[PDB]
Amino acid sequence: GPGHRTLASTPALWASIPCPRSELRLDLVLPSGQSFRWREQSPAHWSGVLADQVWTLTQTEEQLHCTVYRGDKSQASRPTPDELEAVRKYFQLDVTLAQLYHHWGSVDSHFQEVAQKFQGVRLLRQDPIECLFSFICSSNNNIARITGMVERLCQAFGPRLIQLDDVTYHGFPSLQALAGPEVEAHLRKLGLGYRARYVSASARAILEEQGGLAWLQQLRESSYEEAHKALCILPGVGTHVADCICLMALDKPQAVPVDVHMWHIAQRDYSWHPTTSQAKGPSPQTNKELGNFFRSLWGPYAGWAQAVLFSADLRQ
DNA sequence: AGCGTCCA
DNA sequence: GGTAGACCTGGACGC
DNA sequence: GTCTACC
Ligand SMILES: [Mg+2]
Ligand SMILES: [Mg+2]
Ligand code: NA
């Protein structure tokens, strides 16, 4: 298929969004375990599926440049303002990150030192279905392997979009695509391990027991506490996966996912121990306490602060 | 040399 | 509710 | 990281 585009080579096909590097660093956000569907197919150019279409993104110092491959056999053209609005919404650019960074660093000198090096780590606003099933795949696993699982999931069950170079892009699967009684065994052949049952069972649960796709909108509109509790009914979704979905797709900025990294960070960088449990190792109680600790430290956007330290810890 | 343990 | 241990997969890497 | 089984 046609080539992945670069900004310098095809400038007619790109349009810009005002966005300084202090507000966004694509190389620190897109491969850091929020979305698993972006790839740096050319140096400094990131390609992936965003609102049912393939996009490539690249930055200059003050602008985010975007290009869209529409693949309806239409003539190539730069993104329209309406199309760019989807990219603006995905990166939540109405939130001003430099002001959050000032607050987090003011209350936390360790955060301040990390943030000096890791500018522009913000939170994507993801589709709830893509986020739910990607994070069901993430538990007790590593980002490289999760990325391959999500890719093969989309390849097998999501609609084909377009081919660029040797890469065939697919949309994320629907609930209905993942709900069949044959889907689990297929996802096992695709190497999802014991999470194959969780993906298929969770799709069935949403369709058969929760009212379908509208339930995720209910949870978007619900409090953090109510959305967090409700998600945990799903097979494979415990408190960490539920917090990932709350933070990254249901607009709960205070949700703080607590994984192996955040636990290591708490111990190493904060010398933290739980005070609501005599036993100090990970447990339902101590994981709950740690998320409350980070919220008390960083404030209402504590989950966004978590994403900064998580991105940095993947690099260290 | 590559098995087998650690780890995400 | 607290606790312990099993668990798919496959890269890192000590021995 | 979540599940299941046992206290
Ligand atoms: Mg054309
Ligand atoms: Mg559950
Ligand atoms: Na420090």
Side-chain angles (χ1 to χ4, degrees), chain A residues 236 238 241 260:
Chain A
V241 173
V260 61

Coordinates of all heavy atoms in Angstrom, one line a residue, chain A residues 236 238 241 260, chain D residues 1-4:
Chain A
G236 N -11.8 -10.6 34.7 CA -10.5 -10.1 34.3 C -10.3 -8.6 34.7 O -9.1 -8.1 34.6
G238 N -10.0 -6.3 37.7 CA -10.0 -6.0 39.2 C -9.7 -4.5 39.4 O -9.9 -3.7 38.5
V241 N -7.2 -2.7 36.7 CA -7.8 -2.6 35.4 C -8.9 -1.5 35.4 O -9.0 -0.7 34.6 CB -8.2 -3.9 34.8 CG1 -9.0 -3.7 33.5 CG2 -6.9 -4.8 34.7
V260 N 2.7 -3.0 39.4 CA 4.1 -3.3 39.9 C 4.9 -2.0 39.9 O 5.7 -1.8 40.8 CB 4.8 -4.5 39.2 CG1 5.0 -4.2 37.7 CG2 6.1 -4.8 39.9
Chain D
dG1 P 1.2 -5.5 36.4 OP1 1.5 -5.1 37.8 OP2 1.9 -6.6 35.7 O5' -0.4 -6.0 36.4 C5' -1.2 -5.6 37.4 C4' -2.6 -6.3 37.2 O4' -2.3 -7.7 37.2 C3' -3.6 -6.0 38.3 O3' -4.9 -6.1 37.7 C2' -3.3 -7.2 39.3 C1' -2.9 -8.3 38.4 N9 -1.8 -9.2 38.9 C8 -0.7 -8.8 39.6 N7 0.1 -9.8 40.0 C5 -0.6 -10.9 39.5 C6 -0.2 -12.3 39.5 O6 0.8 -12.8 40.0 N1 -1.1 -13.1 38.8 C2 -2.3 -12.6 38.2 N2 -3.0 -13.5 37.6 N3 -2.6 -11.3 38.2 C4 -1.7 -10.6 38.8
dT2 P -6.3 -6.1 38.5 OP1 -7.2 -5.3 37.7 OP2 -6.1 -5.8 39.9 O5' -6.6 -7.7 38.4 C5' -6.9 -8.2 37.1 C4' -7.5 -9.6 37.3 O4' -6.4 -10.5 37.8 C3' -8.6 -9.7 38.3 O3' -9.6 -10.5 37.6 C2' -8.1 -10.5 39.5 C1' -6.9 -11.3 38.9 N1 -5.7 -11.5 39.8 C2 -5.3 -12.8 39.9 O2 -5.8 -13.7 39.3 N3 -4.1 -12.9 40.7 C4 -3.5 -11.9 41.4 O4 -2.5 -12.1 42.1 C5 -4.1 -10.6 41.3 C7 -3.5 -9.4 42.0 C6 -5.2 -10.5 40.5
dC3 P -11.0 -11.0 38.4 OP1 -12.1 -10.9 37.4 OP2 -11.1 -10.3 39.7 O5' -10.7 -12.5 38.8 C5' -10.3 -13.4 37.7 C4' -10.0 -14.8 38.3 O4' -8.7 -14.7 39.0 C3' -11.1 -15.3 39.2 O3' -11.5 -16.5 38.8 C2' -10.4 -15.4 40.6 C1' -8.9 -15.4 40.2 N1 -8.1 -14.8 41.2 C2 -7.0 -15.4 41.9 O2 -6.8 -16.6 41.6 N3 -6.3 -14.8 42.8 C4 -6.6 -13.5 43.0 N4 -5.8 -12.8 43.9 C5 -7.7 -12.8 42.4 C6 -8.4 -13.5 41.5
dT4 P -12.8 -17.2 39.4 OP1 -13.4 -18.0 38.3 OP2 -13.6 -16.3 40.3 O5' -12.2 -18.2 40.5 C5' -11.3 -19.2 40.1 C4' -10.7 -19.8 41.3 O4' -9.8 -18.9 42.0 C3' -11.7 -20.3 42.3 O3' -11.3 -21.6 42.7 C2' -11.6 -19.3 43.5 C1' -10.1 -19.0 43.3 N1 -9.7 -17.7 44.0 C2 -8.5 -17.7 44.8 O2 -7.8 -18.6 45.0 N3 -8.2 -16.5 45.3 C4 -8.9 -15.3 45.2 O4 -8.5 -14.2 45.7 C5 -10.1 -15.3 44.4 C7 -10.9 -14.1 44.1 C6 -10.4 -16.5 43.8

